[PDB]
Design a protein around this nucleic acid. Structure first.
Lengths: 101, 117, 109, 49, 205
RNA sequence: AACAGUGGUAGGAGAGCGUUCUAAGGGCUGUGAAGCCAGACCGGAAGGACUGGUGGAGCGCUUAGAAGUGAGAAUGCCGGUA
RNA sequence: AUCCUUGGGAGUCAGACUGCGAGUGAUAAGAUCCGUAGUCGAAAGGGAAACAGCCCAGACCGCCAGCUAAGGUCCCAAAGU
RNA sequence: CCGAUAGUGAACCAGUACCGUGAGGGAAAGGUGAAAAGCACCCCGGAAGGGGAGUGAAAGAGAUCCUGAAACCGUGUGCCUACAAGUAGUCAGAGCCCGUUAACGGGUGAUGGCGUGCCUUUUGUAGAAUGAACCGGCGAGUUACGAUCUCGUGCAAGGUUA
């Protein structure tokens, strides 16, 4: 299982586990390799001088879509203030294949 | 032209009440108390969208000491060890997770103790 | 399954939910005998509706009327009369003459 | 000018400030007049000079 | 504007030559727009009236006293806060006409006529002779001159032959020689003229 | 595209969404209009749309214009029900 | 990166608290009345147990990212018996 | 311009009813269906009130008689509750139950971390300061005429005409 900085925030990843990360274009349908793998694991080929030299992980970008709509609504509890922000969040349904040590 | 506006009021009343299901009592039923309680539960929302971002860290730091003390170290010393032996930028939920599959964490704790001497 | 509806006989509803809650679930051989003896004098309003509901199931469908399970028995506040009743010191309060709608859905076992 | 596509000039029409409708518009509650002060009450106002 | 004349059947050889100062102006897109809107306005009648608070036929004594019962202040019965009415401000009947300058007023009709020349929509109908006055004559002529929709007919004479016809024809409007105006030309898409009225209109203005 | 900013009362400026009516045509209705109720849909919001059910005759879109143009608070008003 | 004029357009002309300097006071008061500086007012977040004025710091919006300030590091309660 | 809380107070046997000794004040109240075809007959019931039967497109349309919302009042329920201290929510969260305007689904959420309504008025209000029982409807910045500034348009030491 592989630990990957794409984010910037880190994911535990085995091969095939669908992982939602940031919007990264990836032209959804194409393939992107991930480039900051810490802690190969399994046989514990453990990190050192951060980033296992070239232990990258390929991934097949499938979908680029927005999250649930979330209503940011802050209001001051007197004083007549109302700020109602509809909000979306862009993910990318990254499908991950061939953890490469 | 005379403007009744007999519809426009209704549809605003029937979107807040859409957003007010599952509320206790007759805050869910009425309007003119519910528009307070939605107004809280948006202001109560945004605070709590900054707690899970700040308090899940206050989980996994306990979930390091509950493993770092199995190997005889403290979080105040352990997170110094990872900062030296290794420049490891491991996610604190994921140096946690390193607990789900122990002893992968201990072998990182093994990497800690080498520069503790 | 059968249905009888009362539709606006003057009694309060809460003075007829109490007569009703010895019926919902009972039998025809277990409710006409019980309603005659409550005494709770909103009873024979209902007992002229249950017995009329059975003789609906007698004529209109022939559902073996002595073998029926009383299924639904809800009562709703119908069209309310409202009267002003006078009061001392010029108060003139109100009296709400309520009205109810008795529905005794009688069904097969 | 086809009466379908009847659009005005460049910056000659402009919306009236609909004063005193809702909070988030600006100028909703006090309707621009302010707070406790001769001027904020109805009916003016004082003599000009 | 060198538009070919029309025989109203033929139709036809020979072209006319129009004023550049009338039918050859680059049309002013926003000086026209102002002139439709004073034309649409003041065609409205302005007969909207609301019984104001004073003007409502209503008892003016206070319903109850100032201070001393468990109510509100509640001055008059027929006010604005009550069921009985009425509207506070309300609409009162009033005016809508206002006159633009003639250096605009010319240059509106000078614009729209010049615009419709470019868009190939003027068909000059010589002499407009009608041998009877039935509407079935104008049914054939407009269809024979291959126009369908709302249409203007500029008669330099205000004919009884033309104007008794074509008004029951639901789109086509018979116009006075002097009676041209912007909500007739813009609306009815197309305008039919005598040879004599082009002499007239170019020496109206 | 680069760089910086983006709490906020009283208030100033700017941009919008709504509703009703009129004006151009263009376009939906008995193969079901408006309104009503439901629903897990979309935009930054005001807000829109779609399918179902009821409803049984009207209605939206665009583009401008007019305004009795928007509701939570008036010990407001009326009616209903606690 | 502000300032000067010019014009359109308004709000406030009762402020509080803390420190520093003052008067009245009894070198009394969450007292009154000035200067100066902050904050509140118009400012949410963390501290100070709760706390408009102290300490730290400025909320466009999401993240189950990291590093720090005031304050802490036995249990409550995150972090050194 | 209004479309029944509007428009006259009165679309309705309205200056009626009621209120006042009296001058006076002064309401509410529209809609079956295209036409009565307004429910013959049978069953329950004293009778209203129903259930079948027919009438019509509809009868859930049948006497407040088109539409029928909400407060409310019910009846069934899927999930939670009888060691619990709570401005009642939010974020986390297993169990259980369903399958959707196909979406990092929907409902209940055992329990944990946070958290004292909305508005006015204030230096300061969770306020033990005021306001509101709720629900629905009505309800407040214009309009007429001038003066000033920006914005726009036409004409430019010449512009507008009452």
């Amino acid at each position: 299982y592989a630990i990957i900085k794409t984010g910037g925030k880190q994911i535990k990843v085995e091969e095939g586990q669908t992982v939602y990360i940031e919007k990264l274009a990836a032209e959804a349908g194409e393939t992107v390799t991930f480039e900051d793998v810490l802690f190969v694991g399994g046989d514990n080929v453990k990190v050192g001088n951060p980033t296992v030299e070239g232990a990258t992980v390929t991934a097949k970008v499938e979908k680029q879509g927005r999250a649930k709509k979330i209503t940011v609504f802050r209001y001051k509890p007197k004083k007549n203030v109302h700020k109602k922000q509809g909000h979306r969040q862009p993910y990318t349904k990254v499908t991950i294949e061939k953890i490469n040590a | 032209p005379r403007v009744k506006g007999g519809t426009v009021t209704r549809k605003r009343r029937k979107k807040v009440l859409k957003l007010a299901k599952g509320y206790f009592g007759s805050k869910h039923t009425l309007y003119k108390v519910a528009n307070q309680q939605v107004m809280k539960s948006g202001n109560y929302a945004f605070r709590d969208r900054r707690q899970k971002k700040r308090d899940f860290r206050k989980l996994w730091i306990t979930r390091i000491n509950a493993a770092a003390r199995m190997n005889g170290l403290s979080y105040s010393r352990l997170m110094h060890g990872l900062k030296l032996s290794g420049i490891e930028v491991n996610r604190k939920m994921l140096a946690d997770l390193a607990v789900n599959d122990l002893t992968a964490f201990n072998q990182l704790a093994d990497a800690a103790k080498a520069q503790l001497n | 399954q059968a249905k009888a509806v009362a539709r606006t006989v003057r009694i309060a509803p809460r003075k007829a939910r109490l007569v009703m809650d010895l019926i919902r679930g009972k039998q025809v051989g277990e409710a006409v005998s019980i309603l005659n003896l409550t005494p709770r004098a909103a009873s024979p309003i209902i007992e002229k509706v249950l017995k009329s509901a059975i003789a609906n199931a007698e004529h209109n469908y022939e559902m073996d009327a002595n073998n029926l399970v009383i299924s639904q028995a809800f009562v709703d506040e119908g069209p309310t009369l409202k009267r002003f009743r006078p009061r001392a010191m010029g108060r003139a309060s109100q009296i709400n003459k309520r009205t109810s709608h008795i529905t005794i859905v009688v069904s097969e076992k | 000018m086809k009466l379908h596509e009847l659009k005005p000039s460049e910056g000659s029409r402009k919306t009236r400030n609909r004063v005193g409708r809702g909070i988030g518009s600006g100028n909703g509650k006090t309707a621009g007049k302010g707070h406790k002060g001769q001027n904020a009450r109805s009916g003016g106002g004082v003599r000009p000079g | 504007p060198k538009v070919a004349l029309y025989n109203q059947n033929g139709s036809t050889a020979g072209d006319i030559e129009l004023n550049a100062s009338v039918f050859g102006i680059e049309p002013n897109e926003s000086v026209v727009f102002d002139a439709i809107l004073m034309q649409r306005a003041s065609l409205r009648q302005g007969t909207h009236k609301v019984k104001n608070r004073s003007e409502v036929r209503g008892g003016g004594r206070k319903p109850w006293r100032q201070k001393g019962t468990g109510r509100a202040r509640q001055g008059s019965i027929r006010s604005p806060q009550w069921r009985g009415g009425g509207v506070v401000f309300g609409p009162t009947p009033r005016s809508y006409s206002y006159k633009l300058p003639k250096k605009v007023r010319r240059l509106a009709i000078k614009s729209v006529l010049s615009s419709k020349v470019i868009d190939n929509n003027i068909i000059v109908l010589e002499d407009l002779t009608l041998d009877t006055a039935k509407t079935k004559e104008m049914a054939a002529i407009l269809k024979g001159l291959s126009v369908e929709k709302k249409a203007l007919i500029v008669t330099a004479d205000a004919n009884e032959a033309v104007a008794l016809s074509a008004r029951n024809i639901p789109g086509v409007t018979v116009v006075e020689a002097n009676g041209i105006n912007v909500l007739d030309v813009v609306n009815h898409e197309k305008l039919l003229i005598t040879k004599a009225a082009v002499e007239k209109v170019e020496e109206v203005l």
